[PDB]
Amino acid sequence: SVFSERTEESSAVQYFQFYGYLSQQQNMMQDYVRTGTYQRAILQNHTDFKDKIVLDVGCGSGILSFFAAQAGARKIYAVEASTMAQHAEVLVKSNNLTDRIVVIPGKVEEVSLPEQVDIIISEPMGYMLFNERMLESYLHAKKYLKPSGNMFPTIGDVHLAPFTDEQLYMEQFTKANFWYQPSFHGVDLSALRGAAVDEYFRQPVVDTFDIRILMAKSVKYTVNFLEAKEGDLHRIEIPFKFHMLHSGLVHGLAFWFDVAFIGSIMTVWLSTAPTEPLTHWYQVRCLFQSPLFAKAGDTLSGTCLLIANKRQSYDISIVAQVDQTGSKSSNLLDLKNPFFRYT
Amino acid sequence: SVFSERTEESSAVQYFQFYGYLSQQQNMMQDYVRTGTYQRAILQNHTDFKDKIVLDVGCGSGILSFFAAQAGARKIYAVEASTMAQHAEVLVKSNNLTDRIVVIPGKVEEVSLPEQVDIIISEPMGYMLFNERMLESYLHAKKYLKPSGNMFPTIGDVHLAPFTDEQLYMEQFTKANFWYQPSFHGVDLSALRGAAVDEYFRQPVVDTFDIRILMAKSVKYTVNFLEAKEGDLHRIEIPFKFHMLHSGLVHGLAFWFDVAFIGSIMTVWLSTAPTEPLTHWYQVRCLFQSPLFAKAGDTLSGTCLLIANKRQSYDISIVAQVDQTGSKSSNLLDLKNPFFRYT
Amino acid sequence: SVFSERTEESSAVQYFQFYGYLSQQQNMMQDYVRTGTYQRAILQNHTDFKDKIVLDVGCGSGILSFFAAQAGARKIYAVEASTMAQHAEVLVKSNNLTDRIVVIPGKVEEVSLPEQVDIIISEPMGYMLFNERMLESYLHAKKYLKPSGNMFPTIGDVHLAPFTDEQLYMEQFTKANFWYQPSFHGVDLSALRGAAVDEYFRQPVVDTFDIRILMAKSVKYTVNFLEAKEGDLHRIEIPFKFHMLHSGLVHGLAFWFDVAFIGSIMTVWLSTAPTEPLTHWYQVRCLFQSPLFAKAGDTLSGTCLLIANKRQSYDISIVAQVDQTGSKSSNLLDLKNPFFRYT
Amino acid sequence: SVFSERTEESSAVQYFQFYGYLSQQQNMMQDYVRTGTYQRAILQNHTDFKDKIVLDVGCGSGILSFFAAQAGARKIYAVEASTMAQHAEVLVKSNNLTDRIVVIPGKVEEVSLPEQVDIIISEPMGYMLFNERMLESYLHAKKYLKPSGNMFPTIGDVHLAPFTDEQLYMEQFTKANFWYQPSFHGVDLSALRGAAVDEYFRQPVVDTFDIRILMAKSVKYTVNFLEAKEGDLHRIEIPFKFHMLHSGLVHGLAFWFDVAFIGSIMTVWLSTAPTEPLTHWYQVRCLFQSPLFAKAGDTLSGTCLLIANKRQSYDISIVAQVDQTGSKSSNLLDLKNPFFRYT
Ligand SMILES: NNNCCN(CC[C@H](N)C(=O)O)C[C@H]1O[C@@H](n2cnc3c(N)ncnc32)[C@H](O)[C@@H]1O
Ligand SMILES: NNNCCN(CC[C@H](N)C(=O)O)C[C@H]1O[C@@H](n2cnc3c(N)ncnc32)[C@H](O)[C@@H]1O
Ligand SMILES: NNNCCN(CC[C@H](N)C(=O)O)C[C@H]1O[C@@H](n2cnc3c(N)ncnc32)[C@H](O)[C@@H]1O
Ligand SMILES: Nc1ncnc2c1ncn2[C@@H]1O[C@H](CSCC[C@H]([NH3+])C(=O)O)[C@@H](O)[C@H]1O
Known part of the structure; x- marks a missing residue:
């Protein structure tokens, strides 16, 4: 796959182990500038989500998908490669959003989706923006995007x-x-x-x-x-x-x-x-x-x-x-x- | 080898990449207790080293081998698996000890040593003593130790x-x-x-x-x-x-x-x-x-x-x-x- | 002479030009610790000077010779190699001490004194004490010192x-x-x-x-x-x-x-x-x-x-x-x- | 020589010992107005230097010669009488310019050049312009200047x-x-x-x-x-x-x-x-x-x-x-x- 071809195994293991920890998700979620700004971007543009199909690339705990759900999305495919995907599913169930958020465990370069999506959401930015190379996964995911679809961030x-x-x-x-x-x-x-x-x-x-x-x-x-x-x-x-x-x-x-x-x-x-x-x-x-x-x-x-x-x-x-x-x-x-x- | 059989490759990569940094060797070297105590232990027991054949397991920068040289060792085999081995070689040359210290790149479980030694020196201790599992390499090295030989630490x-x-x-x-x-x-x-x-x-x-x-x-x-x-x-x-x-x-x-x-x-x-x-x-x-x-x-x-x-x-x-x-x-x-x- | 043999002419010219300036004399004289302590040492030991013969090595403006004159010295030979010697003469005359202070222009290693002295006074100390090598001139001057003579400083x-x-x-x-x-x-x-x-x-x-x-x-x-x-x-x-x-x-x-x-x-x-x-x-x-x-x-x-x-x-x-x-x-x-x- | 005849030895020694210090060269080099304006003057008049023969009178560190080299000079004779000449040679070598810059240790009034030059560069100005009398060395160097020649400064x-x-x-x-x-x-x-x-x-x-x-x-x-x-x-x-x-x-x-x-x-x-x-x-x-x-x-x-x-x-x-x-x-x-x- 595209991911494995550009990535040493040793790096991928460590990388996805890292994001497998709830404490790291906590640290990211407690960045209120980040989290608040994402929620604001999504909710204040609720029309871009209402009754739309959504792809969340690297959903982690699933927070962005929940934001998308709050905005009225019909269906959100939430892709996550780390074991955190298991925790996201727990939250989907405990928040009674099984009809709207669908966790798809695996790498976005490798999984199969049932349909094309209207909008892609993600948080692929690392240090100096480009670190972690997640932007490439984000861009790779556009194979699932309808021709006139949108991307958050744009x-x-x-x-x-x-x-x-x-x-x-x-x-x-x-x-x-x-x-x-x-x-x-x-x-x-x-x-x-x-x-x-x-x-x-x-x-x-x-x-x-x-x-x-x-x-x-x-x-x-x-x-x-x-x-x-x-x-x-x-x-x-x-x-x-x-x-x-x-x-x-x-x-x-x-x-x-x-x-x-x-x-x-x-x-x-x-x-x-x-x-x-x-x-x-x-x-x-x-x-x-x-x-x-x-x-x-x-x-x-x-x-x-x-x-x-x-x-x-x-x-x-x-x-x-x-x-x-x-x-x-x-x-x-x-x-x-x-x-x-x-x- | 014994090492590879007991170690996930992914872990080994990270492990030896970690010790390949001069800053980490420096971190260890700046621990005065550690370094000073090793030096003291070696030098104050000069009779255990003078004209002896020494094996340094995981020499890193080579500091312990230099201590062994200070103590009058005849020949020191300094084994190092990380890229730090190249830097140890530089210091051996610049300290005019090429006649007495031989840097051997590779894992001690995998390299070939030409002769048995009188004493093995090493710093294989991790957190809780046992972390890193380097003590097993230290003990493994005893295949090169004379039956009457010694271990520093003992x-x-x-x-x-x-x-x-x-x-x-x-x-x-x-x-x-x-x-x-x-x-x-x-x-x-x-x-x-x-x-x-x-x-x-x-x-x-x-x-x-x-x-x-x-x-x-x-x-x-x-x-x-x-x-x-x-x-x-x-x-x-x-x-x-x-x-x-x-x-x-x-x-x-x-x-x-x-x-x-x-x-x-x-x-x-x-x-x-x-x-x-x-x-x-x-x-x-x-x-x-x-x-x-x-x-x-x-x-x-x-x-x-x-x-x-x-x-x-x-x-x-x-x-x-x-x-x-x-x-x-x-x-x-x-x-x-x-x-x-x-x- | 002993001085010329141990001294590069270039250094000597510079050296004695430096001390030929009144501003430099002022700088030294305005060091109250120095000047006050020298006066204290001389005056509170007036008996070591009363009716005695004195040599002042490198008298500069002549201050120490004046202190020796205040302490009752019978005769003071004030030796100075720089042009400051001429200024010292002016002060000796204007202070009506022509009968007691005799300026002898030249290097103490090269001048000729009329008689042996009871005590030698000088300020031969430089940075770190030894800079300027004036201590050697001070010691050299001992050739004019009576066997029972003293040195200030001692x-x-x-x-x-x-x-x-x-x-x-x-x-x-x-x-x-x-x-x-x-x-x-x-x-x-x-x-x-x-x-x-x-x-x-x-x-x-x-x-x-x-x-x-x-x-x-x-x-x-x-x-x-x-x-x-x-x-x-x-x-x-x-x-x-x-x-x-x-x-x-x-x-x-x-x-x-x-x-x-x-x-x-x-x-x-x-x-x-x-x-x-x-x-x-x-x-x-x-x-x-x-x-x-x-x-x-x-x-x-x-x-x-x-x-x-x-x-x-x-x-x-x-x-x-x-x-x-x-x-x-x-x-x-x-x-x-x-x-x-x-x- | 012309230099020794107009200069007391004592003054000369001090003078060239002064310019033998890297800190003094440094002080002059860090005068941005001076160094920058010289570089500017040389480079913006590249036609006066390109493939030309140059004499640098008192090159010190050699900075002006390097400026001349940057401007396309074919050959630069850099004359320097202090020990700085030895450091200039080191820089010509380390800057791979030994084929174009020739350091000549000695006084410009005393050395011999192998050929005539098209232009002379120098920084001979002292306080009030004339202090140090280095302008006379600059003018003296005109014996090596073609009738066509230029002077920088003019x-x-x-x-x-x-x-x-x-x-x-x-x-x-x-x-x-x-x-x-x-x-x-x-x-x-x-x-x-x-x-x-x-x-x-x-x-x-x-x-x-x-x-x-x-x-x-x-x-x-x-x-x-x-x-x-x-x-x-x-x-x-x-x-x-x-x-x-x-x-x-x-x-x-x-x-x-x-x-x-x-x-x-x-x-x-x-x-x-x-x-x-x-x-x-x-x-x-x-x-x-x-x-x-x-x-x-x-x-x-x-x-x-x-x-x-x-x-x-x-x-x-x-x-x-x-x-x-x-x-x-x-x-x-x-x-x-x-x-x-x-x-
Ligand atoms: N600071 N940034 N970088 C992103 C942090 N997180 C976002 C967490 C979530 N969006 C939130 O805000 O809570 C990235 C998440 O995406 C995952 N991830 C990274 N590359 C992936 C790939 N090719 N396929 C699937 N998942 C992948 C990774 O495991 C991580 O959990
Ligand atoms: N801070 N100190 N170092 C010494 C300062 N002064 C003394 C101060 C003096 N007592 C005053 O009060 O002015 C040195 C003075 O001694 C002179 N001097 C130095 N070497 C000499 C020599 N071989 N023969 C004769 N004079 C010589 C020198 O010219 C200078 O004037
Ligand atoms: N700040 N002032 N004026 C002069 C500074 N420097 C320029 C340093 C260098 N060119 C730069 O631009 O940084 C003068 C240099 O010329 C030297 N110098 C002086 N008279 C000389 C002579 N007759 N023959 C050879 N060299 C001679 C002197 O030793 C000094 O190093
Ligand atoms: N099996 C092994 N074979 C060779 N070197 C090893 C092995 N396991 C660990 N090392 C190295 O052993 C070192 C431990 S740190 C001790 C470094 C040095 N002796 C000092 O005391 O400053 C690291 O540089 C590791 O790369």
């Missing part, structure tokens, strides 16, 4: 912007500095200094930050889920040209994302921007191994290249330069293994 | 003691009661409350605690690594009969471990007890499903049965009863997926 | 102690980090990163600090000016064994000095210790390129070696080792060119 | 303007009046007050200031590097006739300078004027011994005479008078020992 925006944060930089540099020791209990570790720096700086930093660290207005990269094909997410090339608003050191690029539910009644946005209330996605920052100096008025140009790997994540390549000086920085990051820094 | 003691922690016990229900509400965004979640409870109680809790919560002198179970066969660790039955020092409610059992390096000059102890400085092993607590009241002087008797599984860990079965009362409780825990509670 | 004590100061260390490392850049205006500087760190950490740090950064009781090295030969100061070896009072990172060694005026009436001390009021000597810290971790109770042992060079200063080699772990650090420092950090 | 403009700054003026006496006391620890210092005043006034003041202190449009003195000879800089006479824009007391003359890179494509300016962003040159002010009162519309006429000395600097003689009143003032200053006032 579009996704990735925002990137350069930042300055000396403390974070030296925080990681310090950790890498351990391997500079010429005599750790009498052992010379310095030969591994370079490998240590590489490793630590391959980690995207997941946390929040004050918006005042940003050195320029963000660049936006948009994926239209109605138009995009699964293959489109294998290799994502995001060019950027920032117009620097402040002078100083650029220590790296900050990432966040918005998704929009473009319904018939209104458009509802779910944002993880640092200007907005915090979500369980936080924000993501990719550090340069060495900061670039730029003065206001300068342009910071380059590319962020995301290559999907078989571990349900992305290999990140960031190349950036100060156009006026030719000061250039490159870094490679492993999105699957971030550094959780929050409090 | 013995390992696991300690069990009953504890009282009302807040820890209540915490589980406070968390699980999230599901006990009739309208979470319109959804009745209560049917899953029981499942949430069970899930939390199956998680042993990793963190430290004040020694005053302990209600009896610990019971000790000793593994002599010189005498033991790896098969002895497939099923570890630890009977206990605690003589209660204090009166109160017993909420479960606390676990920690010591290892001893029994050299020719002296015995050096490494302890992870809650009475000692904290280590990266912390301590482990397993809850009873229901607390047991015990008076000072009463006896709390039962068994802790550790059953090895193919996820490089153990299933923990605990049964305990107050002999004077007949009050009985049990629990069944999954050690592979513990809850890290330490603040 | 002895000098150097104190050294281990300190912790992550900020200072990071501060210097940050400066060095400039030469890690792979693309400074498109130029790769990283090949010089090693040379840059060496240079910055070659700089002793002159400033003051909180005594709470000190991690052990200081070690003392004493020079007796009455007994020492100037040859004794070409190579100064200061071994040390610190009993660590606190656990943590040792970022280097801190230095200060005391001198004692051992008169007939009383002994007067001039101290530059961080527990005492600040002087224009401040204190001096020598950083390790890599800090050493140590626990309280551990022993930090090694050697501070001072090799006199022809730039009127010393090449400093510090080697320190944590005896319990064998963690060892070496650094070389150029005392002539310190980093003045005080603000 | 011209230098020194600007002079009268200023009023009552507090700067009074500061001198505040400092000198330390000596005007009859009993400093029993010593009458007053006889040296005059000497202290003279000393302070002989020091040109280095720092920046508000342009509103300027009392007249600046007078400009231009050195054309294409036309000038070394000998032209031994005696520099700058007559001036200032037309006062404001009424008040003139306390001295302010100095700053511009250089222009006159290329085939465009002219680029590097300015250190007080109307422009600050550089590490700041500005320079020479005080009059006695201020001169002028009314708006009056004319302030006189001469600034710079006489080169063998300490790689100039003796400054300024004489000025208010034509309408005949009120006259002068001053002699030593540009070698300026007072760095900037805070």
Whole structure:
């Protein structure tokens, strides 16, 4: 199947085991920005669900399907590959919605549905939006979508912007500095200094930050889920040209994302921007191994290249330069293994 | 091989990927108690190493082999299955010890060593001593040990003691009661409350605690690594009969471990007890499903049965009863997926 | 002459040009601890001066000779090699002491005195006591001292102690980090990163600090000016064994000095210790390129070696080792060119 | 050599020891205005460099040579007399430019070049432009320049303007009046007050200031590097006739300078004027011994005479008078020992 072909077994096992835990579902459900915004998007666009056939891709506990049911859906096919599917069925029964919500255990790439659906709902967003590669399952599910059908979310925006944060930089540099020791209990570790720096700086930093660290207005990269094909997410090339608003050191690029539910009644946005209330996605920052100096008025140009790997994540390549000086920085990051820094 | 036969591939992948990180080796190396004690044990028993042939099982960065080199070892075979083996080789070269340290990439159950050794060194201890099941590799390596050879560490003691922690016990229900509400965004979640409870109680809790919560002198179970066969660790039955020092409610059992390096000059102890400085092993607590009241002087008797599984860990079965009362409780825990509670 | 043989002319010109400025005299004179303590030492030991013959080595503006005149000295030969000598003459005349203070322009190693003296006074101390190598001129001048003669100051004590100061260390490392850049205006500087760190950490740090950064009781090295030969100061070896009072990172060694005026009436001390009021000597810290971790109770042992060079200063080699772990650090420092950090 | 004949050994040693420090190169390199404008000047005039032969006089780190290489130069001879030459070579190698950049250690007056060059680049400007007398080395290097050749920079403009700054003026006496006391620890210092005043006034003041202190449009003195000879800089006479824009007391003359890179494509300016962003040159002010009162519309006429000395600097003689009143003032200053006032 499409899923197994792009995914190492070791990763899939761990991945679906992870979402098999009720505590993780609880943690996601207790993100009230997420949950509330989804419920609002669905309910305030109740006409897009009323007497409609719905597909919930990766229903988890089934919360989105229940929202769809509240909105008047005739039938909701709720696909879930983890053992959580068993728990969702319990809730369907205890909430007396057996006539409206149908749990279908399995991977959306593998199961069979009785009919085409009018609308697809899902929450496929991970860190930096693209982590977990669930967007591909979401897009893959469009094989079940009627020609004029809709998708909630409809579009996704990735925002990137350069930042300055000396403390974070030296925080990681310090950790890498351990391997500079010429005599750790009498052992010379310095030969591994370079490998240590590489490793630590391959980690995207997941946390929040004050918006005042940003050195320029963000660049936006948009994926239209109605138009995009699964293959489109294998290799994502995001060019950027920032117009620097402040002078100083650029220590790296900050990432966040918005998704929009473009319904018939209104458009509802779910944002993880640092200007907005915090979500369980936080924000993501990719550090340069060495900061670039730029003065206001300068342009910071380059590319962020995301290559999907078989571990349900992305290999990140960031190349950036100060156009006026030719000061250039490159870094490679492993999105699957971030550094959780929050409090 | 012996290793692959007892280990699910998926688990092995994750396991050795984990130790392939310099940051994890660093985490272990920065534990001064651990590293300092190993160094001390090796060096203060220099007669056990000088001009000897040494086997380092799971050398990681190679630190223990360097210690063996400091002690005057003639030749050290350092076996490492993770990619860390490449970094160990670098340090061997940069420390001008290629003539004395030989890095062998691969699992100790699978590689071929050219000769028998005088002493085996290793750090195979995990949470509750037995987690990770690396002790079996350590014991397996004795096929390369001369009949008169030694093991560093020579013995390992696991300690069990009953504890009282009302807040820890209540915490589980406070968390699980999230599901006990009739309208979470319109959804009745209560049917899953029981499942949430069970899930939390199956998680042993990793963190430290004040020694005053302990209600009896610990019971000790000793593994002599010189005498033991790896098969002895497939099923570890630890009977206990605690003589209660204090009166109160017993909420479960606390676990920690010591290892001893029994050299020719002296015995050096490494302890992870809650009475000692904290280590990266912390301590482990397993809850009873229901607390047991015990008076000072009463006896709390039962068994802790550790059953090895193919996820490089153990299933923990605990049964305990107050002999004077007949009050009985049990629990069944999954050690592979513990809850890290330490603040 | 002895001076020219041990001194690069370039260094001497610079040196004596520096002290030819009145603003520098003002700076020294406005150190009230220095000036007041010198006056106290001389006046409260007036009997050591009353009707005696005095040599003032490096009299500068002549202040010490005036103090000696106040104490009743019969005749004072005030030797000064800089152009300040002419300003001293002006003050001697305007203060009507022409009959008692005789300025003799030139280097004490090169001038000719009319007679032997009862006591030599001077202020030959530099940073870390030994900078400027003026102590050798002081000792050299003993050729004019009667067998029963005295020296003010009589002895000098150097104190050294281990300190912790992550900020200072990071501060210097940050400066060095400039030469890690792979693309400074498109130029790769990283090949010089090693040379840059060496240079910055070659700089002793002159400033003051909180005594709470000190991690052990200081070690003392004493020079007796009455007994020492100037040859004794070409190579100064200061071994040390610190009993660590606190656990943590040792970022280097801190230095200060005391001198004692051992008169007939009383002994007067001039101290530059961080527990005492600040002087224009401040204190001096020598950083390790890599800090050493140590626990309280551990022993930090090694050697501070001072090799006199022809730039009127010393090449400093510090080697320190944590005896319990064998963690060892070496650094070389150029005392002539310190980093003045005080603000 | 020409250099050794115009320079005392002692001055030369100190001078080249100064530029032997990476931190000093760093300080100059981190002056973005300077470094950026040079890069800009070279690159935007790429036709003056593409496939051309270049001489870099005093390359230091070699940064300008790298800029020339970026512009397409065929061959660059980079001459450097300090030990920095050894570090420049390291950078040429590590930047894979050994085929195009040839580092030549030594003084430009003493080395030999294998061929003539098309263009000379250098940064020979000191305080007040002329300090350090490196302009003479720059001009001397023209012996290697084809009759076709260009100079980058091509011209230098020194600007002079009268200023009023009552507090700067009074500061001198505040400092000198330390000596005007009859009993400093029993010593009458007053006889040296005059000497202290003279000393302070002989020091040109280095720092920046508000342009509103300027009392007249600046007078400009231009050195054309294409036309000038070394000998032209031994005696520099700058007559001036200032037309006062404001009424008040003139306390001295302010100095700053511009250089222009006159290329085939465009002219680029590097300015250190007080109307422009600050550089590490700041500005320079020479005080009059006695201020001169002028009314708006009056004319302030006189001469600034710079006489080169063998300490790689100039003796400054300024004489000025208010034509309408005949009120006259002068001053002699030593540009070698300026007072760095900037805070
Ligand atoms: N933060 N995000 N990512 C999504 C989190 N959850 C949504 C939980 C639910 N929508 C809620 O809001 O409560 C993803 C869920 O979808 C499942 N999933 C992921 N890829 C799948 C696939 N190809 N086929 C079937 N199920 C799949 C996964 O097991 C997980 O349970
Ligand atoms: N902070 N200190 N280091 C010393 C400061 N001063 C002493 C202060 C003096 N007592 C005063 O009160 O002004 C050093 C003075 O000694 C002079 N000096 C140094 N080496 C000399 C030599 N071999 N022969 C003659 N004079 C020499 C030097 O020119 C300077 O003036
Ligand atoms: N901030 N000012 N002015 C000068 C700075 N530097 C430019 C550094 C470098 N070119 C850059 O732009 O960063 C002057 C450099 O020229 C050197 N220098 C001076 N006189 C010399 C001579 N006669 N022969 C050879 N080299 C000589 C000196 O050692 C110094 O390193
Ligand atoms: N069967 C095995 N064969 C070889 N190496 C193993 C095996 N099981 C675990 N390891 C390695 O053993 C190490 C345990 S951590 C101990 C690392 C090092 N000796 C130190 O004390 O710092 C990890 O690096 C594992 O990859």
